[PDB]
Enzyme design. Sequence first.
Site, PDB file in Angstrom:
ATOM      1  CG  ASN A 258       3.511  -3.269  -1.853  1.00 52.42           C
ATOM      2  OD1 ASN A 258       2.679  -2.386  -1.649  1.00 52.42           O
ATOM      3  ND2 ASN A 258       3.186  -4.443  -2.348  1.00 52.42           N
TER       4      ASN A 258
ATOM      5  CG  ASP B 176      -2.671  -2.785   3.561  1.00 50.08           C
ATOM      6  OD1 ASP B 176      -2.869  -3.445   2.510  1.00 50.08           O
ATOM      7  OD2 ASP B 176      -2.004  -1.730   3.586  1.00 50.08           O
TER       8      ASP B 176
ATOM      9  CB  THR C  55      -0.918   0.032   1.234  1.00 50.53           C
ATOM     10  OG1 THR C  55      -1.958  -0.934   1.080  1.00 50.53           O
ATOM     11  CG2 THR C  55      -1.573   1.398   1.403  1.00 50.53           C
ATOM     12  CD  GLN C  56       3.844   2.696  -2.556  1.00 57.22           C
ATOM     13  OE1 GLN C  56       4.315   3.647  -1.929  1.00 57.22           O
ATOM     14  NE2 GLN C  56       4.455   1.529  -2.642  1.00 57.22           N
TER      15      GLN C  56
END
Lengths: 233, 234
Positions: A108, A59, A1-2
């Site tokens: 990441n 997430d 996840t950015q």
Amino acid sequence: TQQPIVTGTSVISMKYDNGVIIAADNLGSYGSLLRFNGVERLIPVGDNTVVGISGDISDMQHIERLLKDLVTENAYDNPLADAEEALEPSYIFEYLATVMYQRRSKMNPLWNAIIVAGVQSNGDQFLRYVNLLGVTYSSPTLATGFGAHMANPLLRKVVDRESDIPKTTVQVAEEAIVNAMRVLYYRDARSSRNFSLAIIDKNTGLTFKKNLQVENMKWDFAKDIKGYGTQKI
Amino acid sequence: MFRNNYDGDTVTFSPTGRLFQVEYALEAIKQGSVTVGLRSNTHAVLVALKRNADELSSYQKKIIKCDEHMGLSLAGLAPDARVLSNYLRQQCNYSSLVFNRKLAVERAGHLLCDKAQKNTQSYGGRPYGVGLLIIGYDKSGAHLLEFQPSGNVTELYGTAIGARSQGAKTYLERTLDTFIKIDGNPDELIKAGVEAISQSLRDESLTVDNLSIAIVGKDTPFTIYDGEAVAKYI
């Protein structure tokens, strides 16, 4: 996840004489929109561990699934999966810590802060933290995000040093936790009034309390606050 | 004569459903020298007879530590033993790094089984032609496993493999009721083991040069005794 989209705020936790307590509210935010209100962010793994997660909810869901998979895998060809060879909190932690550092190192991240709470087979309290950077630490109290700033100072008044632990009862710890949850509701703009709490006790096992509400609030005095300086009415 | 047509590779059943290449692999173990394993509720022990090439040479190691709480002994192809024990070392290590968890001996046996099995079902390679006796001490206590070239791993109180191993294996069956009760008494479990392996000697004697011993147990990390370390038991 950015970058995180749907998010959970503080998870907070403390040790007491015979186990650990962990709590997290039931909100999934979407920027400043208080979007989802029945989001469970405490994740029991077996009867001895509860994994509380803050940050990106996508997430979090991915991690939930990783954990269920561990439970499944551990049971394969394992006649003592419900006993001697059950998952220990320390195994769940080490696994997650390994995963979080790997994902950080591939640029990441799993965009989360996680506290793992439980009781080891020898009866020892287990309380340890890991986040999106792979940073890990233990302390008699742990709290993520906003809770690190306001819950920790409250909780440390109860268990300030290692020796305070055996002097602390469930009853006392649970009261401390709930009070901190009320304080977060007062001052965290991304908090909800509704939350879950879990106790893991070396004797009584896991006790998972869903649908708690922040209660006994003070708003009284607000009737007397007028203007911002000179205004009298 | 008929067997000659069906034994060319591990990828061929005989008309009675034998895999002769796997059966032949079993025979490789008999070319090794004897080793014994046995256990009580507190300890597990290995005993090996080491060979030399002549009076100018060293004796070949038979016992390999795989982790603090696990190791093995071998009879058969030395290279195979090197490959499979390194594999075990890696699996133990993986279990520790990722999970902060000692690899259960039962799980070690399963991993070993699956690896060896693959060599028996595909063209290109061959079964492993070595036998392994695996001892360990994990959360469920003391263990002894026997590994076969077929991949099959069996949990036992005691056993023996290699040349002339029948004698020791008979002695271990005969003494079963006694040795499994040797708890909190490691030297006595070792004595039982040395006695067992002795039943497999033919006009040859156990010396500080040829006798190798290993032990693991409660509060007892996997330790290998050779040389003068074995004299008290001779």
